C-alpha cells in the first residue's frame, strides 16, 4: 500500500520492528496518528496504548508507559520509557537511593542457585585443616 | 568491557560532558523537526534519556 | 594424620570441587542470556545519540 518503517524500541529491548500502514498514539498535545509520509517532528507521548497497523491489515496493540516519538524522512522510531516517568516520581527514586546509601543495609539479589552453592561452598571449605595437612608453601 | 569469554577490561568512561562524536555530529541535512515544546526542552529530556541508557547499558 | 579423617578430609575436598564445578555449568548457562540482553540494549541508546548531535548542532 504506501506503508513506512516502524521502530519502538525500550532503553531494555526492542518491542518492534517492520512496516505499517498507520499508528495511533495519545501524544502530549493530544490524539495523535501518523500516516505514512508525515512532516519530520520530535514529540513526548504520554503514558497508555499505541494502535500499530502492521502491513497487510494486521493490527497490534502495545502498552507504553511514554516515550519520545521522532518522525523523519522515511523512518519513525518510538524511544518508549520502561516505566512511567515524571519529575514527582522521579524525586521519589533519587530519594530512596540517597536514604539507602546513608544506611548499609542489606538486601537480597535474585539468583538462588547462587545463594545456596554459595552457601555449601562456604560449609564443605570451612574448617579443613587440608593446607596443614598437605605440605604447602605460602 | 566484555571483550570475549576469557577477557573483561575494567574502563571508565566519560559520559556527561557529552563527549564529541565526529560520527553523530559532523554530517547534517535539509530538513529539521517541528519541536512541539521548544527544541531546548527536548534536547534536555533526550540527554538524560542517554546518559540512564549508558549507565544501564 | 590418622587416615580415618584425612578420609573426610578428602570427602571434603571432593565435594567443594564438585560445587565450584556445578558452579561452573550454571554460571556457563547464564552467560549466553546475558549477552542477548546487552545486546538488546544497543539500539535506543545508538538511535537517542543521532537525535541528539542532529539537535544539538542548533
Known amino acids: 500500500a504506501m506503508t513506512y518503517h516502524l521502530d519502538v524500541v525500550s532503553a531494555e529491548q526492542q518491542m518492534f520492528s517492520g512496516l505499517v500502514e498507520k499508528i495511533q498514539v495519545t501524544g502530549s498535545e ?6 505514512p509520509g508525515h512532516a519530520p517532528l520530535l514529540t513526548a507521548i504520554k503514558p497508555g496504548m499505541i494502535r500499530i497497523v502492521k502491513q497487510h491489515g494486521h493490527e497490534e496493540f502495545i502498552y507504553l508507559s511514554g516515550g519520545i516519538l ?3 524522512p522515511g523512518n519513525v522510531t518510538v ?3 520502561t516505566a512511567i ?3 514527582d516520581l522521579d524525586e521519589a527514586r533519587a530519594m530512596e537511593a540517597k536514604r539507602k546509601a546513608e544506611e548499609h543495609i542489606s538486601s537480597s539479589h535474585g539468583d ?4 545456596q552453592a554459595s552457601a555449601e561452598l562456604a560449609k564443605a571449605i570451612a574448617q579443613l585443616r587440608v593446607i596443614e595437612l598437605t605440605k604447602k608453601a605460602m | 568491557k566484555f571483550i570475549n569469554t576469557m577477557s573483561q577490561v575494567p ?3 566519560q559520559l556527561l560532558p557529552l563527549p564529541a562524536s565526529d560520527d553523530d555530529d559532523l554530517k547534517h541535512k535539509s530538513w529539521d523537526y517541528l519541536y ?7 534536547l534536555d529530556t533526550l540527554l538524560r534519556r542517554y546518559v540512564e541508557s549508558q549507565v544501564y547499558q | 594424620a590418622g587416615a580415618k579423617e584425612i578420609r573426610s578430609k578428602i570427602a571434603s575436598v571432593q565435594n567443594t570441587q564438585k560445587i565450584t564445578k556445578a558452579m561452573e555449568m550454571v554460571a556457563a548457562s547464564k ?3 546475558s549477552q542477548d540482553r546487552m545486546a538488546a540494549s544497543r539500539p535506543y541508546a545508538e538511535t537517542m545519540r543521532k537525535v541528539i548531535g542532529h539537535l544539538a548542532h542548533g
Open chain 1, 79 to 81: 524511544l518508549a520509557d
Open chain 2, 36 to 42: 512541539e515544546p521548544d527544541p531546548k526542552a527536548l
Open chain 3, 31 to 33: 552467560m549466553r542470556k
Open chain 1, 85 to 87: 516517568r515524571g519529575q
Open chain 2, 11 to 13: 574502563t571508565i568512561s
Open chain 1, 112 to 115: 538462588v542457585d547462587y545463594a
Open chain 1, 30 to 35: 493530544g490524539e495523535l496518528g501518523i500516516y
Open chain 1, 70 to 72: 521522532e518522525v523523519q
